[PDB]
Amino acid sequence: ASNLKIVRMDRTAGCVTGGEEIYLLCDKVQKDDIQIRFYEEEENGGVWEGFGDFSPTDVHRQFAIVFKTPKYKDVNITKPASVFVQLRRKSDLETSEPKPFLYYPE
Amino acid sequence: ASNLKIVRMDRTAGCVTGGEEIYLLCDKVQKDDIQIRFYEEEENGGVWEGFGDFSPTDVHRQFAIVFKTPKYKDVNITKPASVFVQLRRKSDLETSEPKPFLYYPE
Numbered sequence: 001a002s003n004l005k006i007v008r009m010d011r012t013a014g015c016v017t018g019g020e021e022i023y024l025l026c027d028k029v030q031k032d033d034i035q036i037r038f039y040e041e042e043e044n045g046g047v048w049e050g051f052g053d054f055s056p057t058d059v060h061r062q063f064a065i066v067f068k069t070p071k072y073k074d075v076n077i078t079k080p081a082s083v084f085v086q087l088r089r090k091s092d093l094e095t096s097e098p099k100p101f102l103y104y105p106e
Numbered sequence: 107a108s109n110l111k112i113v114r115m116d117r118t119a120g121c122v123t124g125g126e127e128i129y130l131l132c133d134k135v136q137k138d139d140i141q142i143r144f145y146e147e148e149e150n151g152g153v154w155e156g157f158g159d160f161s162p163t164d165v166h167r168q169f170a171i172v173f174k175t176p177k178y179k180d181v182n183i184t185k186p187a188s189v190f191v192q193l194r195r196k197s198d199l200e201t202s203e204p205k206p207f208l209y210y211p212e
Contacts, residue, residue, distance in 0.1 A: 028167075061169045063166060
């Protein structure tokens with residue numbers, strides 16, 4: 001929808017160890033009721049999830065968030081791991097349409 | 107000032123040939139009355155200037171602009187060339203406090 005929406009991200013891939021800064025342009029969000037969720041449906045095993053590292057201060061005028069990537073689940077991957085990133089409102093867990101994110105082996 | 111203000115840029119260096127995408131978080135600006143100016147006071151020789159490549163569509167809700175870097179003046183530099191980037195309102199040529207930008211040799 002447009003409520004929560006990732007307009008564009010400056011990085012769509014990142015080192016498996018996480019900790020990398022990303023500029024994410026989004027539709028209006030509340031700095032204190034927003035988290036960036038990286039996740040991967042582990043199919044039969046469920047769903048892995050990691051959250052972008054940032055504070056309300058990194059939410060620029062409610063239309064962008066500069067954050068750092070979470071460490072992927074398996075920091076010893078041999079080849080790229082495809083996950084998803086979605087904006088998610090903390091209160092009611094509302095979600096944006098996901099964006100593909102590639103985690104690459106260090 | 108705060109009128110025009112570059113809050114943060116995801117890249118502060120770039121290839122001398124230009125054409126590189128940068129996410130720039132800024133204070134409120136008007137998508138049709140804004141340009142991103144890269145410049146270098148050529149001291150005795152004056153001032154070199156290049157403008158970020160983008161259209162009003164790349165101005166995200168008046169608080170960010172995704173643009174591409176201009177080609178530096180000397181595309182054959184042997185070592186990093188320091189310039190400045192400032193937001194500049196097209197109409198009255200109002201300016202933001204500059205941000206250091208490093209152009210590196212291809």
